[PDB]
Amino acid sequence: RKQTITIAGIEVEAEIEGPPGFVTHQRDKDRKISNPTKPYQNHTVNKILSVKVTDKLKEQVAKDALSGGNGYDEGVGLFNNSIFNVFKEEFNSGKELNDILSSLESVARQNSGAFQNTLERYKKMLDSNNVINFLKSEAQKEYPKLKSKFQTKNQEYIWLIANLDQSKFTKIASTSEKYLEKGLTISPRSAFINEAGEIDSNGWGPPDEYNTVTSRLRRDNSEYRVFDYDEYYSRSSDRIANGTYPGWVKEDVSEPYSKKYNFKASDGIRFSKLERINPNPAKGKLNSGLVLDLDVSNDEAYRRSKELIEKLQKDGEQITSYRIKNMGEKNSDQAFKDILGALPKDIQQLELFFSDKATNTASLIALENKNIKELSLYTSGNSLKKAWSYNPLALRNTTWINTIDYNVSAEYSSHDKITTRITFNTLAFDQEDFSNGSYERINDGLRMVYYARNNEPFFQGGHGPGLEPDKKLGQNSYPTGLDFSRVTGIKSLKGLRFDDDLDTSNEPRKITELTLYNNESYFEISSDELNEANLQHLSTGEGNPEKPKIHFSNGNNTTSIRISGKTLLSDEGRRNLDKYFEYNESLRNSGKQIQIPNGSDELKKQLEGWGYK
């Protein structure tokens, strides 16, 4: 312990710790609910607990925020950036002082979002406040007269930034000094000057050996991916659509196969070869791979896909990637269980491109040996729509689901196709997961996501990790929706567990949303409401303005909750009945109850259970 590390060129003494290992339990192996081939770990690199800050270090961290340093934020520092450099070059021209007019024209024409974005980084100093004159170079003689002689506020305070002296700014602000004691240096892009003539920021970064995000993405792209690459970057939408990878080259080879298996180039079946540009002799695992492309929006490729997938198997030609494109694009009820079930028991890669006008992920691939560290769940539509679900049991013997290749931003054009991995906040169980009145297969599938594989990015849903994903599984995100629309016997959270069997080491999960099957205008329920699991449907937390949701597969539930059986409600029976009226809109509107003709009318608000509409 108690070593030295470098953080700004400067060598510094620091307290350093190794990342806690993911503790797998032997019950996570014997239920086949842990990762099937290799235990994943999220924190690949060490932690900095404290850094001995010194005058020599914090003035180096000051000079980097002014210059940009020599890293990625070079050319966006306080006195070396695109707006500051365009203003200094005009002051360096031979013209008279009123060329300030042309600098203002360079903020009205096209650049109105680069100024009024860089301006803020000076503005807290730039508004005079009885301080600005001490940080104003030789222009301190001109300022007190010339202040009266400006035609617009911007034309004035442009003349402050273009005449500030960099040599005055060797002081760090009180908050940004404490992040430096945690070992995170001011980002030169996030640096601003506050009121007191001192450098502060809205952003701080570790040294790259201590970055948790890029070291994880590097490790995943270099060893979990088939068609691996040495970088940490996600693939572009054009790379994802064309099926191309850094350090690999693609050739179309469809002609021999089209001649063997009798298809036209228009029939929507393709074969392509990938080969690594520098081959790797040192381990025989993969240097080239045959890839099968099936555009199932075509009707020849859909008709023949199962036949072709089997003719390639009995001929013994080996496929490294199957790519199934436009699933559900033409017809949203289009089935795939017969096609996905015809694929080999042992597969290197599977890319599925689902249509978001279908959002039909109902096909299930559990009873296999292996997806060899690749399943890609992709769309060319809206990938963060609340109607995106997976069955958690459908991934049981998939080693890694692709969670990189995330390509969503506000800055894309509308009306072009962009491809990305799906964000899932829903777990959706299917009818074959509830055969004998047993709740066993669901509690396995539920804990798979919520604890047994939770340290992996895919099982975290759309919000990602906490501070320590491998240790404190409770502090991490999870899919907060449950859908039971396919599994008609479930009426409640009865028989469902939301904690790890343990308790003192982890948070218990809370769901925000619950979809239930219903078939009639009445929600029929037994007197199990005494023992529906109660506090487990409570959003993320207790104080929130927005309450959690209940939904039904029909929406016709504007007739009552029909309460059946003779047994009286308890105190938690009352509390559970409230939630179905509160959390479901089309029940909330009138609060209607039905008691079928037995018992006392222990409740005082209901109809006599007619069943007529």
Side-chain angles (χ1 to χ4, degrees), residues 10 53-61:
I10 302 301
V53 68
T54 62
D55 308 21
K56 234 73 73 178
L57 175 66
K58 70 190 186 191
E59 300 320 320
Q60 174 73 333
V61 170

mmCIF file of all heavy atoms in Angstrom, residues 10 53-61:
data_model
loop_
_atom_site.group_PDB
_atom_site.id
_atom_site.type_symbol
_atom_site.label_atom_id
_atom_site.label_comp_id
_atom_site.label_asym_id
_atom_site.label_seq_id
_atom_site.Cartn_x
_atom_site.Cartn_y
_atom_site.Cartn_z
ATOM 1 N N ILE A 10 3.856 15.091 -13.059
ATOM 2 C CA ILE A 10 4.333 15.145 -11.675
ATOM 3 C C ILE A 10 4.053 13.837 -10.929
ATOM 4 O O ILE A 10 2.935 13.334 -10.926
ATOM 5 C CB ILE A 10 3.709 16.370 -10.957
ATOM 6 C CG1 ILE A 10 4.027 17.703 -11.670
ATOM 7 C CG2 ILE A 10 4.104 16.470 -9.488
ATOM 8 C CD1 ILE A 10 5.503 18.045 -11.832
ATOM 9 N N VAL A 53 -1.823 16.241 -2.302
ATOM 10 C CA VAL A 53 -1.716 17.479 -3.076
ATOM 11 C C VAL A 53 -0.617 18.388 -2.514
ATOM 12 O O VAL A 53 -0.442 18.514 -1.305
ATOM 13 C CB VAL A 53 -3.084 18.176 -3.201
ATOM 14 C CG1 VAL A 53 -3.613 18.725 -1.882
ATOM 15 C CG2 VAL A 53 -3.032 19.315 -4.216
ATOM 16 N N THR A 54 0.140 19.029 -3.394
ATOM 17 C CA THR A 54 1.245 19.943 -3.072
ATOM 18 C C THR A 54 1.198 21.165 -3.980
ATOM 19 O O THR A 54 0.591 21.117 -5.054
ATOM 20 C CB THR A 54 2.614 19.258 -3.222
ATOM 21 O OG1 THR A 54 2.816 18.848 -4.552
ATOM 22 C CG2 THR A 54 2.814 18.054 -2.318
ATOM 23 N N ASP A 55 1.860 22.252 -3.575
ATOM 24 C CA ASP A 55 1.906 23.494 -4.354
ATOM 25 C C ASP A 55 2.355 23.216 -5.802
ATOM 26 O O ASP A 55 1.707 23.629 -6.759
ATOM 27 C CB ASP A 55 2.819 24.533 -3.665
ATOM 28 C CG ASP A 55 2.553 24.848 -2.176
ATOM 29 O OD1 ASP A 55 1.931 24.051 -1.453
ATOM 30 O OD2 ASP A 55 2.994 25.915 -1.700
ATOM 31 N N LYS A 56 3.414 22.405 -5.961
ATOM 32 C CA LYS A 56 3.986 21.994 -7.257
ATOM 33 C C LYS A 56 2.988 21.242 -8.157
ATOM 34 O O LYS A 56 2.953 21.481 -9.361
ATOM 35 C CB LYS A 56 5.273 21.170 -7.026
ATOM 36 C CG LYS A 56 6.505 21.689 -7.778
ATOM 37 C CD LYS A 56 7.106 22.987 -7.217
ATOM 38 C CE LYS A 56 7.836 22.773 -5.893
ATOM 39 N NZ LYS A 56 8.451 23.988 -5.374
ATOM 40 N N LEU A 57 2.146 20.374 -7.592
ATOM 41 C CA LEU A 57 1.091 19.667 -8.324
ATOM 42 C C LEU A 57 -0.063 20.590 -8.701
ATOM 43 O O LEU A 57 -0.500 20.576 -9.846
ATOM 44 C CB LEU A 57 0.578 18.478 -7.488
ATOM 45 C CG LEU A 57 -0.620 17.724 -8.101
ATOM 46 C CD1 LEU A 57 -0.253 17.002 -9.396
ATOM 47 C CD2 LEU A 57 -1.124 16.722 -7.079
ATOM 48 N N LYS A 58 -0.602 21.370 -7.758
ATOM 49 C CA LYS A 58 -1.824 22.142 -8.056
ATOM 50 C C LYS A 58 -1.588 23.310 -9.012
ATOM 51 O O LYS A 58 -2.477 23.640 -9.785
ATOM 52 C CB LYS A 58 -2.594 22.511 -6.785
ATOM 53 C CG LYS A 58 -1.933 23.552 -5.889
ATOM 54 C CD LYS A 58 -2.698 23.627 -4.567
ATOM 55 C CE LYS A 58 -2.180 24.748 -3.670
ATOM 56 N NZ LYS A 58 -2.743 24.637 -2.315
ATOM 57 N N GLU A 59 -0.374 23.850 -9.079
ATOM 58 C CA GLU A 59 0.009 24.806 -10.123
ATOM 59 C C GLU A 59 0.270 24.155 -11.490
ATOM 60 O O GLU A 59 0.003 24.771 -12.519
ATOM 61 C CB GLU A 59 1.200 25.651 -9.658
ATOM 62 C CG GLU A 59 0.935 26.481 -8.393
ATOM 63 C CD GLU A 59 -0.446 27.134 -8.316
ATOM 64 O OE1 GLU A 59 -0.931 27.627 -9.349
ATOM 65 O OE2 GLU A 59 -1.044 27.162 -7.222
ATOM 66 N N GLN A 60 0.694 22.889 -11.542
ATOM 67 C CA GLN A 60 0.693 22.126 -12.795
ATOM 68 C C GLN A 60 -0.738 21.882 -13.296
ATOM 69 O O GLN A 60 -1.025 22.050 -14.480
ATOM 70 C CB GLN A 60 1.462 20.810 -12.611
ATOM 71 C CG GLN A 60 1.417 19.846 -13.801
ATOM 72 C CD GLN A 60 2.245 20.268 -14.999
ATOM 73 O OE1 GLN A 60 2.508 21.429 -15.250
ATOM 74 N NE2 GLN A 60 2.703 19.334 -15.783
ATOM 75 N N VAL A 61 -1.657 21.527 -12.397
ATOM 76 C CA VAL A 61 -3.078 21.347 -12.731
ATOM 77 C C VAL A 61 -3.737 22.665 -13.155
ATOM 78 O O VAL A 61 -4.605 22.648 -14.022
ATOM 79 C CB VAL A 61 -3.811 20.654 -11.564
ATOM 80 C CG1 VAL A 61 -5.334 20.634 -11.685
ATOM 81 C CG2 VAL A 61 -3.334 19.199 -11.480
#
